[PDB]
Structures are given as C-alpha cells and as structure tokens.
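Students often ask why we bother predicting the structure of a whole assembly rather than each chain alone. The short answer is interfaces. A chain on its own may look different once its partners are present, and contacts between molecules only exist in the joint model. In this exercise we take two input lines together and write out one structure for the complete complex. Read the inputs first and try to guess which parts will touch.
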Amino acid sequence: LRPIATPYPVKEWLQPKRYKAHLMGTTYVYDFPELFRQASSSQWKNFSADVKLTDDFFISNELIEDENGELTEVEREPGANAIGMVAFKITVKTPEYPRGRQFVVVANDITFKIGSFGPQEDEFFNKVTEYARKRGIPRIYLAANSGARIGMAEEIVPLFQVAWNDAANPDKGFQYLYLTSEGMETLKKFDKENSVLTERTVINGEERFVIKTIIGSEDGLGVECLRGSGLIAGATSRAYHDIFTITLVTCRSVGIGAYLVRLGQRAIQVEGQPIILTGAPAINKMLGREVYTSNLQLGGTQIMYNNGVSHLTAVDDLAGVEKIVEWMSYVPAKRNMPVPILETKDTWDRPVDFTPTNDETYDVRWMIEGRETESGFEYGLFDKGSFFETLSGWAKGVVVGRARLGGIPLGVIGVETRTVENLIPADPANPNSAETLIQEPGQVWHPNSAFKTAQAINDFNNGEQLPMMILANWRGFSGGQRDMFNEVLKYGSFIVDALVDYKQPIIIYIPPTGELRGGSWVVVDPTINADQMEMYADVNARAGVLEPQGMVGIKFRREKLLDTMNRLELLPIYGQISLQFADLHDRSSRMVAKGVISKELEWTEARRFFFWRLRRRLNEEYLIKRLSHQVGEASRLEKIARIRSWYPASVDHEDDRQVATWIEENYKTLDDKLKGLKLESFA
Amino acid sequence: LRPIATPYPVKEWLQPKRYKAHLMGTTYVYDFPELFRQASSSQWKNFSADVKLTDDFFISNELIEDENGELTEVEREPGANAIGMVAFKITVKTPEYPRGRQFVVVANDITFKIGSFGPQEDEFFNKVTEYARKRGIPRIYLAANSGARIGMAEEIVPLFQVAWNDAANPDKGFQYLYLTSEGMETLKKFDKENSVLTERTVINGEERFVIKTIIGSEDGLGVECLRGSGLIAGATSRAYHDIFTITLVTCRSVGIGAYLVRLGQRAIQVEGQPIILTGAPAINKMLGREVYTSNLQLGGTQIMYNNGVSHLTAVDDLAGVEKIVEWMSYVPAKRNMPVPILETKDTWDRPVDFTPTNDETYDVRWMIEGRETESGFEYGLFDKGSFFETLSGWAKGVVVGRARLGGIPLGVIGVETRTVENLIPADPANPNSAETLIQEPGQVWHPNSAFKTAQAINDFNNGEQLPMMILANWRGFSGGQRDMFNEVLKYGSFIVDALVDYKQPIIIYIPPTGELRGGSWVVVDPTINADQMEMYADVNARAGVLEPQGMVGIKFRREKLLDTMNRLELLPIYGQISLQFADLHDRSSRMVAKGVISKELEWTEARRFFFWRLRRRLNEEYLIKRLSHQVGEASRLEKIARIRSWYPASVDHEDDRQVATWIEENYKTLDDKLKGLKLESFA
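Now the answer. The structure tokens for the assembled complex follow.
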C-alpha cells in the first residue's frame, strides 16, 4: 500500500518510479525541473533580496517526438515516457536576463531499463542536441545511466538444439547449435523468423537447421546500440563548438555515459556518483584478482576531479543544479548574443585594494576577488563575489574561472604562486607502488598546468563566447627530464592553438610583482592573434628572455666584472651590481619603448582602466560584426578603420570611455549608416 | 691558410662558415639544397632504376627580402646572408609529379650569432611561412638554433657609476646606478642617448643621472625577441592547418626552437641533436646539484621519440632529408590538389596473401605491407614496399603510417596485437625512483595510444589531405585506475573530435580475426561523420557491446543454464554452449542485418574491393567540390544526388569500378554540364 497517513499525497507512491530513483541515490528525472526553479529562485534571492518572484518567472515544458519525429511541447503525468531519455525546454527570467532566457535539459531516466542507451534513446538525445544547436540555446545534460543497452535473443534460448559429437556426452563438445523444424515453426507463428540465419541440413534422421547467426527480433541488443552511441558522441562533439554545453553526473555515467561527460567538456560531479568505462566486477574478472573494491576507485571524484574531467564537485543534485545555473549566469542567452552584463553593488569606479608584495606570499585569488581582513574588506581587480572558479581540483598551478568587471562577464586566468603538493595515489592493480607526492613549483607551467590553461582558453571561447584576461605571470615551462618526457611541449603548444582560435577580446596583463620570461612569453604574445589580443604590463612587473641570474651568468662573467672593478674580496657586492644591471633591462619602460606592450599600468588603477578598455572593445567588436554582414568584406583592418572614420572628429580614438560612450549613444544612428551602405554592397 | 693541396677547391676554406657548421655537427645551411637534390635523385633510382636524370630536374632558389620586404629570388655566394635565417624555393620533378612540384625550405643558420632568433630572423621566418601558405606550398623547416637572442646594453657597462652608501665600501651596498654628465655625453656623440632612461639629480657635489631603465641602442636584447617568437609560434600554428608542414631537427633546437618543432607537428630528429626548453647547466644551477649530465637527457631521441614529439629519428642530416622527401611523396603538390597517385609494379588486381589466424600471434604490419617468407613473399593489403610508418617509437599499441593502395595515397592505422613493454626510465633530478616497465596489452586503447590515434587522424587530415583507413580492432579503452587517473577519457574524445574534422574519405574496417566492442566502437562509428566515413566488417570479425564472457556473465547466469539442461557436473561444456550462443550475435551477418556496416567483406578480396571503392569516392568527392563552387550551395546530400542524376541510367550507382570509370571518361563532359549551370547560379 502507501505510508498510511501523511499531510499530502505520497509522491513516491503515486509514481513508483520516483521511489526507484531515490533508492538509487538520485533525483527522479521528472523532479529535476523543480530543482532548477528552486536554484533559479535562490539566484534571485542572492541578487536582490527584496524582489518578489512569481511562478511564471520559470517555465518547464517536456519535449517529446510527434508522429513525424519532430520535437514538440507537451504536459503530462511524470512517468509516461516510453523511452529512457527525457528532455525539457526551460524558459526562466534571471538577474542577467529579466525578460527571460531559454535552454534545454536532457536526462537519462535511471528508472527506464536502468538508464541504458538503446537506439531510441540515442536518436532522441541527438534530436534534442540539434534542437538546441539550431536555436543557439544551451544544452544541459543530466547523466544517470548504465551505458549502451545489452541484449540477447531470449526467444532462442528456450528453443535451440545442440549437435553433440558423442551423441550423448558433454565432454566431447558440440559441432553447432541448431533448430528443429519445430523451432522454425514457433518462429513462424510468433512471426520472429528473422531472429536467426540458418542452413537446412537433414542428417542421421531429419532436417536440421544450423544457426549461423543469431539476430534477435527484439531491437537494442548489440551493434545497433553502438551505432547510436557514436552518433551522440559526435553530436556532442559538434555541439561543444556550437552552444554552451554542460553535464551534471547524477547517479553514475557508464560507456558513452562517461564519454558524453567529457565530450561536452564542462562537467559537475556529485560526490559518490561514478563516471566509468568498465565497472570493477568486470575488471576483476579479467585481472583474475579482487583488486578493485568499488567503482568510486575507478571514477569517483578523487579521480575525475583531480583529473580535470570534472570541473566541479557537488554535495548533492540540487547543489549541482545551482552550479549550472550560476555558471550559466556568465554565458549569453543564445549563440552570438552579447555577453550578459550584470552590474552589482560593487561599482567599477574604485581603486584596487589588495596588492602583492615582492617578498611575502599571497593567494592570487585575493587579487582576483579581493580579501577579507580584520580591518575591513580589500577589493581585488574584479567585482566582489563574482569569481566563480572551475577545474579547481586539477593542476593547481593555475587558477581559472569566470568573473565580472563592473558587471562585465569574462574568463579569468591567474598564476598560483604557492607551491602545489600534488599527491598521486597508488594503483591497487599493481601489487606494489605506493603514493607519490609531486612537488609543483609556482609560476611554472607543467604538463598539467599548461593543459589546464589551454582547456580554460578553449572553454571560455566555445560556448561561453566570453572575453578573457590572463594575469600572465610565469617563469617559463619546466625543462626537467620528467616534464619533457611527459610532453610539456605538446600541452604548451595547445595554448597557442587555443589563442589562435579565440573570437572575443583578450587582455594579457603582467601583474605588480610578476614576470614573463622566454619559455613563457612566447606562448602568450599579442601577435599570436593580433585581431583579439592586447598586452599590458604593470610598472612593477618584470620581463626578459632570462631572469637576471641566468643573464649575468652569460654576459657579465668574472672577466667583465673585474674590468668593472678596474674602472671603480668585493665579489658579493659587485655580483649584486651586475644582477641589478640586468634587472634594469627587464622594466616595463623598455617594453613600452620596444613596442611590445600596449601600455604600462598601475595596479590600483587597473580596474578603472580595464573596465573601460573592455567596454570600448566590446562595442567596437559588435560594430565590426555588422560591417561583416555586408556583402563584400575585407580585412578586419579595413572594417575597424572605416568604423573609426564614423567617429566624430573631436572624439579621441584613444579614449576608451569616450568611444564607448559615443558608440552607445548612437547604436541606431550607426545602424542607419550601415543600411544605406547595403545598396553599395551589391556591385 | 688552407689544406695545402687537394684535387679541387677546399670548400670549408672558401667559406669558413661551412667549417663552423661542420665543427658543430651539422650541415652548413647553404649545403642543404644539395642534400635535397641527392635525396630527390635517390627517390628516382628507387622508383625506376633506368630513367636518366638531368640537373634541371631539380632547382633551388634562395629567397631574400627586397627594398620593400617582399620575397624575391636571388643567386649568390653562400654566406652573404645578413640575417640568421635562410630560405629556399625548391622546384623538383618527382615520380609522383614528373612535371615538377614546389615547396619552401627555411633554416636557422647555426653560424650566424649561434642560430639565435632576433627580430629580423623572426619576421623573415614568418614572411616565408606566409609565402608558402599563400601558395599552398609545403613548408620544410630546418632547425639548428640557440633560442631567442639575448643581449645587454654593452655601451653602458664601460660608463656607469654606482651610488654606494658608505661612499667607499662595498658591503653597505648601493642605492642606484647612474651616469655622470660625462656619460650622458658619450651617449650624445655616439648618438645613443635613448640607451637609457634617467632623472637629473645633483647631490653632494654635482648633477647625477639615475638610471631608471636600461634600454640599449642595439636591438634584439629582450622582450622584442619575445614578440618575434610568439609571432612565429602562431604563424606555425596556422600553417599546420593550412599546408603540409614538417621540421627536421639538425643540430639542436632551443626555445621557440623546440616549440616550432612541435607546432609544425610532423618532426624528424637526427640522433644526438637535442630539442630543449632550458639546458642542463641552467637547470643544475637552479636545482643546486649536478643532476643533469648533458642535453640529450633533457631532449635526446630517447625522450622526444619515445614521446611522440619526434615522429621519426634520422642517423644523419641526409637521412633526415630522405625521410622528408619520402614523406612528401604521399602529399599533394599544393593545398587542394588531388592526392598524388603513383602506381608501381604491384598492381591492384590480386588477392591479399597474408592472413591472421584466430589463435597464433602476428605483426599487423604484415597485413599492411606484406611479409617475406622462406617460401616466397606474401602481399598484404597495401602495395609492396609502400608502407611508411611514423611515430613508431611512441605508444606502440597503435601503428600508423602512409601507404598506397593500387597507387593511391592514404593514411593507415592498425592495431598492435603483441603486448608492448614500455620501459619508462627514471629521472635523475629525483634522488631515487628507478626504471619502471609499463605492460601495455594489445587491442586496448590507453591514454597514449588513444592520443596517437587522434594525432594520426589529425596529421593525415591537415596538410596531407589524405584519405584514411582504420583496420579497427580494439577491445575497448582501459578502465583501470591508473589509465583513468591519467585521463584516458580526454584522449579518447580527441579521436571523435578528429573524425568530425576529417575532410577526405574514411574507411573503417574490422579485419579477419579482429573485433570492435563497446568502449571502442563508440569512438569510431560511421555516424560520427556520415559525410566521409564508411564501415566494413570482415566475415570472420566479431563485434558486440560485450565480449561473450562479459555477456554470458549477465544474461546466461546459472539459473538459466540449469533450465537449459532441464530442456536437454556438465557446467564446463554448457558454459561453453552459452559462450558460443552469445558469439552467434557478434557476427558480421547481424551487423549487415542491423544496418550498421556498409558491407561484410572477405579479406583476400579486400584489396580489390577497397581500391575501386576509394577510387570511385575520390571521383565523387572531386565532383561535389565543383557543384560547391556554384553560387547557392545545399546539403552534401543534394549535391551527391544531382551528380548521380548525371550518371547514365544503365550505370549501377552501386558498382564502384563502373562509376569511377564513367567519371574518368567524362571529366570534361561533366565540366560542361556545370558551366551551363552557372547562368542558373545567380538568381
């Protein structure tokens, strides 16, 4: 029956599927929309405590295929899903988009054939990904599956005969399995003839039908489930470069299940829910020993999060939905919309408080989001409380996240100065090899931190279409035997490749007590992508091919030191003079002189400078992408030149705030100028 | 003087630079063209022994910048190069292109300021890469450098004063370095005022000029060399997706030097010549100990070749040039030319001899290029002697290379069945951790072998623009703790991403005794890229979500076994029956039935089938890329449909040889059909 007497209807009773979901440690799939409403609601409470919300601020519409396989909206009792894949079209008004924003949600129904992927679920999953891609809408995937669906032609077990050699004795084996003329018959009546492929062969009595291939009448048993998974693997590969994609592992993901998680890139893993290719039982059978205890060893957060496969971990489903909603607040409503501006209590016009000290360790996060101190709060470069760090459990040499600058969304990459104690666990499978601690020195790229940088750059660019700033501060890549053997060169090159691809404005800024040297300057120079990149150096930063020590150890050897004394025992001191002699070359003053940076800057005035610089550029970019929808394009150069020709003569092309201000005051006026350019965009 | 009396002029004497190159273990840069002629000459000798060659079969033209910085051809004494970068435009008649083919050659002149990269060399290197990109011509780079150029303002050493605290005592230190009114003067006469940035400050006597920033009058000292390197890093990043790019490490490559090697991807390393980021000396200074003996430990072939950073190793320069020339024989003359067909003694029309045996180990290479045996030679699938394996020292679980099928160029990927004994050396830097042997089981993707597969797919597609065949035979990816911790998921996804990008025809073919299971089928299914991929399975191959054992261990548990006995102690035997029951599901007959493969095939007849299938498709593709240069394109579907509508009614669209034959007989006729389609490609 049902729990005798509760205040309201017993949900798990009305729809038993709900209880089955819960028993497996996951939210019932039809219950997730309520999770997004709750999260979307909290989102508002944290933005403007007062604002009174209404249920019509959030709308969830289930999507199902019609007579024609086309997606349409329906409202129905939860649990009517005929397949094991479910989808929702969600329209919600949020702080960044008060008038509303949409996105789709697809999820494995863990209660349908165990969340397995059959041909039907796969084509549905694919049909939804396209629905979203066509609309430029984000695709949120909720993974709670058991991998590809596995079958066997059950209607052949009961009726199938062997072909024993000894005619009546196991041991000697058999020569084939077959069907009598009786078997074939049932397969006739129950119209399942095509279940097998056989050859007629009367022998030692009467006609025997040798089975040459078992096919099965029931679909979803083998290779057809493999066609479907590859279909969505590629679908997901394509979507990632097309719309914002994100996956939340909610109970477990297996097979294409784990692959769908990675292919969509951005991932949030709920503690305790595994992402695996093969489970322990199976692996143990192979290995022959009881080497793996649970699946959490093969793919728990300790692996996938320390991995970088899982961008974030979540204590429970709702927390995972909260991360998604919060991540989405930095992303455009649909492909190619301007990035979602959201100004908050923290206004742009202010100095930056926290400042690093040449000698004294700090947390780069403090420079980004600010720091709380006994004597008040010290704001960092970005808006108070806007820093949303991601991939925080892997390659901690680099910190990456989204943040706001005067309300402007942008990807942020900073350098971790504190050494990292990466503790690499031991693998059971190997009788004996134990823990291993890898010391990762700060301000140095390693194979994993270089990979993370490339990854961050790509994730910022592909669905988020966000601008980016890199507080460049690396001494270079590690040249040790291990790091090279481990391909540090491949991962470094990934960075360059990613900067070439970047479609939004980029700011590279060497911070107050930081530096950029040979190995590291190369992979982040403005010329790698003149179209979008710009570089700025702090007045107190340093930059040169070699650090002073390396440089002195080559162009100020003792011989030259001595002749120096000669012109005016005393090594310790002079050795220092040489050091400082070099250091005088690595100043922003020289960078400015040599034309390698756009401007040298003062940290405490950076927030003011960058806010307007970025605002001005976002405005110019938008204009370029209008002359582009002309009919006879030309170089980015010809477009920016002609757009700047439209500026009033008195406007200083060099004043970011003026330019941004005049542009926002003439959006329509500028739009007219274009219209009457069209009739000149035919010939 | 010179070696007193030799038969002919002493080369190393006429141009001392030559001797300096040789002393450093490398070929003098102006001598490389002769290496390409020698190699190009050998190439002919191995193709058609008789053919009489003439010096005009090969032409080398040095390229230098003119008054306008534009590249032009010149003929001049070797050693006149004013910069440390040199380039050649090479036109050579080869077996695949008897009428001639071109390509450029750029090289660091190891004898010019030690092969350092100054702003001039960098802009020259970049100007040449573009020259090539614009022409769709291959770019061969010869790396023999010392990294970014390092300087110091030497004209400030002699004349610079300190500011001692004790007025006359090292220890107490100084407060700044400065120049007298005398210093400033010399800087005036020798017109090098801008060499420094100072502030006037009379003190305790008379005007002192505090140096706030040393700039230098001589260019090429610091950050400006960093701008240049990043410029070419990006230039090389772009070129790789645009033209065939290849690099030969000839003496050593440092800094952008190592990065240029990777960025261009394809690389051949001469034994003994290091590719490094930082040298040992420097690293030891940091670490404080004498941990690294030579540079070969940081980047010799044992690291870069076992790495996959170096595709091939070469015993000496000429051998490296031979590999380049041989690699280039599979690549088109310029971007978008049809792949270079080269038929040889081994005609297509023949059966394939070598065949694997279900139980008995073999070398997959034998299936590819054939095998030599006591009782004659047994041809494999591809042309005898056409298999050019690459990346052969890294991730040996996969074998990759170029080969010919009846003279047709194509990338080939096979699966190594024999277990691999990957011996991971110990790193010195770490007081104690020794060798480690990683056992890599066959027919299983691992992080490194999956990476190699993706890499191969990308390298085949980007400059080589080659078709490809994958003798798919993997049991799946490794699900162990280590392999997952090591991101096997990221590298697997790289494969999918690479198949999505493929622009030429693809053939996925499960070989005679091979298989494709769940973890592995997913990442290589035809739907990942319906436009170019096709899948075929051998009549003796197997495929299913799980191997029989895993499948029995789920849908044929004892309960069901027993009831089976019941319908007809005896476990060993029945257990087998269950196994075979499953195995009957994994047949090509079912794949064909379920519509997941294009055709099941017989190995010995494969060469005949694939040759024509590929030939037919190359012909159809070329036609699609003509309707494309229409004016109002549509789906690939609409184009192939209309092209097939042009075929004569009696032509069987399913007969590859007929179709290929009719198409080659009507190239011009088909070309007319298009012309008079143009007037219908306006409205």
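Check your guess against this: The radius of gyration of chain A is 31 Å.
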